[PDB]
Amino acid sequence: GAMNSSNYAELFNNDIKLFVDDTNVYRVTVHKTFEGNVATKAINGCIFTLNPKTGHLFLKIIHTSVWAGQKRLSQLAKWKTAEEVSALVRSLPKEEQPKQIIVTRKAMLDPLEVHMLDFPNIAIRPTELRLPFSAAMSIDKLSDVVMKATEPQMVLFNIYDDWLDRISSYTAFSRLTLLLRALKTNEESAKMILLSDPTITIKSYHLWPSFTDEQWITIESQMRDLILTEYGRKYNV
Amino acid sequence: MNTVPFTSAPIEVTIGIDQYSFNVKENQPFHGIKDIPIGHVHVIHFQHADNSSMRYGYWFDCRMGNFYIQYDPKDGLYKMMEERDGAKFENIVHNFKERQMMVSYPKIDEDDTWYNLTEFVQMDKIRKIVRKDENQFSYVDSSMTTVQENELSDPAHSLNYTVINFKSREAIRPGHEMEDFLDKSYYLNTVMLQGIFKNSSNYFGELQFAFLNAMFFGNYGSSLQWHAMIELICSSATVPKHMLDKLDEILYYQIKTLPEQYSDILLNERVWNICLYSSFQKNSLHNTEKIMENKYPELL
Numbered sequence: 001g002a003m004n005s006s007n008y009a010e011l012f013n014n015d016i017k018l019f020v021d022d023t024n025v026y027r028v029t030v031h032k033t034f035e036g037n038v039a040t041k042a043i044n045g046c047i048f049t050l051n052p053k054t055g056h057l058f059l060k061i062i063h064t065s066v067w068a069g070q071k072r073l074s075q076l077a078k079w080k081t082a083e084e085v086s087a088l089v090r091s092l093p094k095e096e097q098p099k100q101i102i103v104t105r106k107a108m109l110d111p112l113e114v115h116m117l118d119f120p121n122i123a124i125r126p127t128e129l130r131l132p133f134s135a136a137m138s139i140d141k142l143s144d145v146v147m148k149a150t151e152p153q154m155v156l157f158n159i160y161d162d163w164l165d166r167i168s169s170y171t172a173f174s175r176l177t178l179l180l181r182a183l184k185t186n187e188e189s190a191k192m193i194l195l196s197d198p199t200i201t202i203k204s205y206h207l208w209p210s211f212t213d214e215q216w217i218t219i220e221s222q223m224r225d226l227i228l229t230e231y232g233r234k235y236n237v
Numbered sequence: 238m239n240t241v242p243f244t245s246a247p248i249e250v251t252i253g254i255d256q257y258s259f260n261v262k263e264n265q266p267f268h269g270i271k272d273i274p275i276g277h278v279h280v281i282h283f284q285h286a287d288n289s290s291m292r293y294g295y296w297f298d299c300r301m302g303n304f305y306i307q308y309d310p311k312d313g314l315y316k317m318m319e320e321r322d323g324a325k326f327e328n329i330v331h332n333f334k335e336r337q338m339m340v341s342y343p344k345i346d347e348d349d350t351w352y353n354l355t356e357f358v359q360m361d362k363i364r365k366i367v368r369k370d371e372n373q374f375s376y377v378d379s380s381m382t383t384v385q386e387n388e389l390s391d392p393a394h395s396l397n398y399t400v401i402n403f404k405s406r407e408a409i410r411p412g413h414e415m416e417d418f419l420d421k422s423y424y425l426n427t428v429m430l431q432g433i434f435k436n437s438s439n440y441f442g443e444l445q446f447a448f449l450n451a452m453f454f455g456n457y458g459s460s461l462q463w464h465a466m467i468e469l470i471c472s473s474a475t476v477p478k479h480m481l482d483k484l485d486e487i488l489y490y491q492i493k494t495l496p497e498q499y500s501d502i503l504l505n506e507r508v509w510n511i512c513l514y515s516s517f518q519k520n521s522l523h524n525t526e527k528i529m530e531n532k533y534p535e536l537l
């Protein structure tokens with residue numbers, strides 16, 4: 001059944017699992033036409049598929065060409081997500097295939113269940129957690145590869161950089177969701193925090209800056225402050 | 238006309254014959270039911286006055302033999318049986334009529350209700366759902382489970398309904414996942430109609446039979462089957478025109494016949510609202526939609 005606050009630590013056991021998030025698959029800008037009607041223009045998207053134990057991110061880039069001539073794109077986007085996740089699973093050796101796939105939005109359950117009928121032993125699960133993975137496009141290097149793509153493409157990342165050399169996967173996921181929640185609540189301030197100090201750089205093969213243990217504690221504290229603030233700035237408290 | 242005689246009525250029981258029913262007192266001088274229309278299947282059913290648990294009964298066709306009822310005090314129920322000695326059977330029936338010990342199947346001449354509820358039902362196909370090959374009639378009761386229910390435990394005593402499962406490889410063609418799940422026409426027309434039933438009459442026959450077991454015995458797995466067969470048609474964009482017209486007539490009479498007070502358990506809100514308001518066939522069931530809206534507007 002559903003993943004929630006009470007079975008949180010199952011994410012860090014030794015059963016392979018993937019989170020799937022489809023919130024950035026179908027993306028548009030809305031604008032006015034010369035006649036003063038409204039129209040959408042699609043921009044490139046991505047499926048966010050994450051192993052929370054290892055940090056491996058399977059970033060499937062959705063090129064706008066996949067929408068050409070199609071109707072009901074928001075419904076199609078859920079099925080295209082399921083089709084790509086199923087193709088990914090089939091591409092993996094049996095011993096790397098997940099035992100569970102956790103979708104971040106309930107609307108993905110039926111599409112994914114149907115595409116995965118060949119894998120009856122893979123559990124498709126929803127979650128009650130309000131995870132901030134929509135903010136993945138606030139990571140500059142992820143946004144950059146999606147926007148530059150000229151064709152469909154899969155790109156592989158470790159979203160934890162080298163953190164697992166020093167911290168556990170539980171702590172690494174807690175850090176990741178804190179950063180992403182901050183970026184979702186106030187992107188500009190969150191990005192200012194992460195990059196205000198020019199002496200701390202992002203390695204070419206990493207996504208985040210090379211903070212020491214002590215600097216991550218200060219960073220993490222600053223992101224909590226930001227989130228709490230915006231919560232007042234918003235609800236006025 | 239045909240007759241189903243009763244050896245006796247030793248325990249107080251409510252007796253049903255098709256959509257009719259009457260009460261019989263413990264050891265009342267009751268010897269059966271006469272004037273039963275030939276040409277239709279029928280169901281004779283029972284609810285003991287002492288145990289409203291377990292409604293149970295027998296589907297039969299008068300053309301397939303001479304059948305009678307006899308209470309069994311060991312197994313504690315009214316059992317259907319076949320009399321092979323035809324002479325013995327006419328002699329019995331004639332004596333019981335002469336003494337006027339029988340109730341008359343009470344059909345109004347204008348009244349086509351039973352025909353309209355059983356139009357497509359075949360009795361030889363019913364013996365496939367309720368497998369007991371040594372009898373020509375078929376026992377059903379409230380508690381019997383379906384094959385599909387046993388998958389999700391005694392197979393001898395199960396309802397072998399056609400397995401319908403919308404999230405199954407039978408239902409979904411590789412490479413047409415979204416198409417086949419949102420428009421089930423392939424599954425209705427090719428897998429089920431052409432592949433299993435052979436024709437639409439067999440589809441309506443099982444659908445009519447499932448409904449009647451749900452209504453007369455409160456059989457939960459039968460209600461599931463009735464709603465699934467409805468939903469498969471309503472969720473297909475391409476259905477023969479004659480099938481939709483006939484489905485509308487079928488459902489109309491089922492809704493008309495349902496007890497007003499059982500609507501809350503025999504009717505699945507989700508399927509009906511889909512069929513009448515969201516599905517491809519939302520504008521194709523004019524008679525069913527009108528009786529549903531005038532009789533059970535609460536469900537909608």
Ligand SMILES: CCOC(=O)c1ccnc(N)c1
Pocket residue numbers: 357358359360362363365366398399434438439440441442443446
């Ligand atoms: C084989 C499942 O049942 C049927 O196909 C059936 C049931 C009742 N009447 C008819 N005509 C057919």
